[PDB]
Symmetry: D2
Subunit: 446 residues, 4 copies
């Protein structure tokens, strides 16, 4: 079986339960829900359908609701026709939504545009297709020198590298989508356009205000600022999502692959999950994936793409997984040890008891060869760990004591078909210490 997890974004062509069940077989592990479109009626059904499939089949799966996030946008162009901007010429951005663009100027969805900006700064239109330096700003007008030739189409995204934009972590709508997440009880929330440590707090603050406390926050890094603040942001988050394309528009090309690498390394050390979103696939892509997985990503995600797409990502996840190796060089010490020994003894698995899922995470850090079977009485947690690499969670009634665990665990591991009589198996867990503390390890033959 593969170990890497796959995240698909679901939609119309794929929301039926019959579709979802097949997608589960193809390899999907989490259902993404993009708040950039659709509605509460649809999404809620989408979600319902997944859960019915789960009940009907014993299959497990997480649900992640993806935030739209703040966004600046260029408006309307005369007769809806693309205009061509010439280098060195003048070009003007406006705050007035009424205004119909053309080759002389254009309106932006962002009222705060005039403010945050400054002459000297760089503006970047439509996925950085066109750069410009702000020469002037007066009233609702942003006046600039185009730095290079290009076609300005309508509704193009704007980027201001380096500038801190005063929009909120939370769009107005962004707040409503969250509540829906909590009411629905989504497992994760991938927050968009996160630039500094505060952005994570505000969503945590927000989710807490609506019963969302046990929801993991996956911060989406998408720019020079979030990149600079990554440590802080990673600190505050429950996970991370490397938005390659998005980030690619805001910084040097030779940096992207690296950023993705530093982010993943940092997440791994940190015990936090990381989703990598890159661009049959073109080979550039099939190796871009494999590389993300070699870099050690927990999960790869699939976007607007579908049953064949799944299976290919799924035969790629397996092929790259089957050749990776552990990375051995208190919870740490126990966990590393578990793994190592796991490996020395040739244990096919490593059962683990986790309430909040931390120990499965801590174990999964060393890239074990064995599958982690994680035990839990907590349902959100059982759902969440579906995101994490090599983990295979199992909700359980209870675990009375360390010895009960070992006993139970052995019954379970044997039921999983993941192990057999004579198999040695390593058990990791807590013993006389609060949650959030892994500290006991134990070998056992099935």
């Amino acid at each position: 079986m593969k170990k890497t997890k796959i995240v698909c974004t679901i939609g119309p062509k794929t929301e039926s339960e019959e579709m979802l069940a097949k997608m589960l077989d193809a390899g999907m592990n989490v259902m993404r829900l993009n708040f950039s479109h659709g509605d509460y009626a649809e999404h809620g059904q989408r979600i319902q359908n997944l859960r019915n499939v789960m009940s009907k089949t014993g299959k497990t799966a997480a649900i992640l609701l993806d935030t739209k996030g703040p966004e600046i946008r260029t408006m309307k162009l005369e007769g809806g026709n693309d205009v061509s901007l010439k280098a060195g010429q003048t070009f003007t951005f406006t705050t007035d939504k009424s205004v119909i663009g053309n080759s002389e100027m254009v309106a932006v969805t962002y009222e705060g545009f005039t403010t945050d900006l400054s002459v000297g700064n760089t503006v970047l239109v439509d996925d950085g297709l066109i750069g410009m330096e702000v020469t002037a700003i007066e009233g609702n007008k942003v006046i600039c020198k185009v730095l290079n030739n290009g076609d300005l189409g309508e509704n193009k995204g704007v980027n201001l590298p380096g500038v801190s934009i005063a929009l909120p972590a939370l769009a107005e709508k962004d707040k409503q989508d969250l509540i829906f997440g909590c009411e629905q009880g989504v497992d994760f929330v991938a927050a968009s356009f996160i630039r500094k440590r505060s952005d994570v707090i505000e969503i945590r603050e927000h989710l807490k205000a609506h019963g969302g406390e046990n929801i993991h926050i996956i911060s989406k890094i998408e720019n020079q600022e979030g990149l600079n603040n990554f440590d802080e942001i990673l600190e505050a988050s429950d996970g991370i999502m490397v938005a390659r394309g998005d980030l690619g528009v805001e910084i040097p090309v030779e940096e992207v692959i690296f950023a993705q690498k530093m982010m993943i390394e940092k997440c791994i050390r940190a015990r936090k999950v990381v989703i990598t979103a890159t661009m049959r696939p073109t080979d550039a892509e099939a190796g871009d994936v494999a590389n993300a997985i070699l870099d050690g990503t927990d999960a790869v995600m699939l976007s607007g793409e579908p049953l064949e797409a799944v299976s290919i990502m799924a035969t790629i996840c397996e092929r790259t997984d089957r050749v990776m190796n552990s990375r051995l060089e208190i919870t740490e010490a126990v966990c590393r040890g578990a793994v190592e020994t796991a490996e020395k003894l040739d244990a096919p698995l490593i059962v683990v008891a986790t309430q909040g899922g931390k120990s499965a995470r801590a174990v999964r850090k060393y890239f074990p060869d064995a599958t982690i079977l994680a035990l839990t009485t907590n349902e959100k947690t059982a759902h969440q760990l579906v995101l994490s690499k090599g983990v295979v969670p199992q909700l359980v009634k209870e675990i009375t004591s360390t010895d009960d665990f070992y006993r139970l665990g052995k019954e379970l591991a044997l039921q999983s078909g993941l192990a057999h009589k004579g198999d040695v198996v390593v058990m990791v867990s807590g013993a006389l210490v609060p949650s959030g503390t892994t500290n006991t390890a134990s070998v056992h033959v099935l």
Copy 2:
């Protein structure tokens, strides 16, 4: 300065001595001549302008002559019109070149088609565009079930994956371009579609028969059969060219990045050069490269693409090189040592004497942080060294003995601007041993 070498394909837009002198400043290291087009006069001019540039500036550069190689193709279609192939329908291939194609059948340029093929096999037309399984074969006819919908144009490329194709090794025109090589005295010849050790032999054999004894043969791996005989192919070749696309059409997507990976590894171990040929650039590509560099390729190529392309590829070469590490875990011992010590002492350079260039290869296999400065009396060897990672060759008049070598080397090293007063410097070379044997290292302060 980078250390990964760049290989650019030159053309009309890039042939003047003024452009070529620019491209060298941009990072180019080896001119590729693609025998796929052009003519002897142009190419020869192209080569002359490079050499002029060389004399003029003292800049060095090598010269690869890349081969067109053999192929299986589809012929003529009625009216010269594209036919529409429907899935599951029958479609027959014919050995008889006189036959004019249509929706029901088409003739291939390959007489052995019937022979090498066999029921069950997959036939792939126009770059993988359309696939077909072989149902029957009889007379000059290959009967097939068409696997998927597509349009058949004329002169389309055929590929029969897995199959051992009985075509010859060199094209007839191939034979002619090689001689021109041997007359113009190019540094390397990259053979095309190399499937088994003998194909390598045939080129060597041809090259010797016309003054080409010292030309290195870099072999292009483009399919399953070459892939499977890699060891022997590598053995007999002087180096290798990872042809990603071509490979991408012949075997599973999830394999390609792994084929490249195993190629580079085995090359480096083998002391031979490997050039990476992958698909401002889409991020996928900008990483694809870096990854190739990280996996350890000596050089990366640039095709039909131009002065900015080179520069970028440079910045990508310098940026990925600046963070790799040596890889330390008789010629070998000496060489390895030379490197670790080079490193212990903080040596900015490792002067090396080479006739055939093997010693410099030997040093480089360890991925030195230091630049390898190479001394040679042999010009072909000096040019070819350009294709090597981190190596900086220098033609020198002579070296009378181990001690002359040390003294000269010191002089040279200081002249290079590469090292200075107080810099330690390691110096490998042969001593009382035939060429092909390295065995002496000596540390020195400038």
Copy 3:
């Protein structure tokens, strides 16, 4: 505190409970009863006075009954006067007990003297004071040339180096002292002159007929035959005792220090005990001790030597102990694990539960810096662990489970004064597995 355990041979001048108490203060851990002298009343008393100081102060210590064993001896001399033997002269030994020696001949206590011997063999008189080569053998006489000048006193000890002597495993008296040992419940019996595996089985077999089943048998290695079968002897014993002087008589001087070194390593890896008997002490001696510790002996030994001797031995034991280091390169896994982590985390101690003493041992093998505190409900086992390096037993009423164990252990760890609040502490023990299997480790802060 030192971790190496010191063994004391008790006698008249040191048997008072008063004396013993002071001896235990100075460092003594074991009471050695040399069966080569004294009588069942005196030993018994010696035993009881110890057991008394034990009850009276909670101290712990064990008692080893050292066997006299079989031996060959010269007998009576005319007028009981010492005869001077001249080099090269003739001298003969006889089997006939009635015969009274003189300068030409002497009888031996050993009837198999003629039979096991052989012309050319070396015969060693009185702690090798005089050597002699066997020149002839006829009837009950063994005719020999004298190799060196010396006086033969009566009742002299005989050594046939290299010879395989057929004496039995146990003297008739030996079987008698063994029973008393059983009656008295000593901890260990150090068997004398062990030659081959059968010797050990006889001893073991005899103790079981005596209720001595849980008595550890320690093999005394005194000659080449014993040294040859070491591995098989060690396998059947519970531990070994390196009898230096005795070995010195029986084999090449250059071999003894290395035979010692070999026996200790093998015994370590075997998880079995080894007591070191070497020859204020002479620096030679002082060093000789230090080195047995460096070689890693669990325990050293003091003979006919008394309070100052125990103390010094001890200041040397601590001196050497304080600079040793662990030795890290199922039970093994866990135990190796446990110590390493113990060391990583600064654990000043390693609690361990043991019935049989096995895991305390297992842990021990790694030469931990932390003290091993061993909890056991078995007192025999608690006594025997006194013999083990760095281990410190504690008898406990019971442990109901792994968790009961942990809670209990931390109470006891803190009470020991051996550890404090904030201190980290490793705990090993079995979980769901029979005795003889260690398999679980857990870290805990006091």
Copy 4:
């Protein structure tokens, strides 16, 4: 052959040319001349017969002058009679030489006896045979309590543990002996009772005023103050000597084996020689030596002991060296490399060119398995190296260049019988660098 060097102190019973050469055949490697006795005529003869033997057999051997050194001593007793001292009694020392002692008092040779001492101090008489506590000092007398019962004979040597005795570095006849050693050209002078760096300097100045510049100074560490300044004394000397017995009298017992262990370690690392002087032999001793070897001493010394002594000494050296192993974890890199490389390739020997003997030294530090063959034109140097571990020196005419060296060393190696056709051999040397610098290495097949 053994690699460890042996030092034999020579005497009447061993000064004959017939006796010496037998000794060299027994294993002797340096002749120790003890200036504690004898005269200029005898010792010189003693060196004569040695040099002669060398001439007549081509055997090499070095010669060490050993210093008597300054001292404090007790004097004359009434009637030249021994007095018995009873414990707790009073006893007094006096700085007055006229006074003839008795059971109440005895004068000392050392005028600073009062000044350097202090109440509470321990005074050891006649090789520590009798301890005494200083209770008072007034005028020229040192009042003390006898610590134990014993007989005081005349002219007994005194030791003041821990005290810093202000005697000079050189006893007045010590300078004379030094001039004899210069005139006689000895290889090494072993200085006595070295306490601090300045003592080592004084002697270096004394040999220099007499053409002694090439004689290596081996400082003998006898007590606590010198053990303290060892780092600085090691620095200023050419090697050291661990005078166990004298150390054994001056500091705690558990401390000596460690002091010897620290000295040897710091010696090895410093590329300096160390002679270990420990107490058929008693096991203790035969193991004591082996341990010095295992600790890594260059050489072991023989004292007032003779042909069988050397033999056994040697057979132990072989039995020990045959089981030691290299110790691999500028000159340093090159030499470590050389060794390591030497070992990887299986070289039986490592030729080294040396003037000053240094590189023979740097190479040996690593504990090579291969014999070092050192080539030199300096005969002092060649004699000196005999003292060095595993080195085999050779005087040679000249070496014109690095290449000649290689050519020469290759003939020599094969001639030595130490290697053969097909054997690889690693050669080190200097190259374009003043003496004191090693920096070249080169592998060769014989």
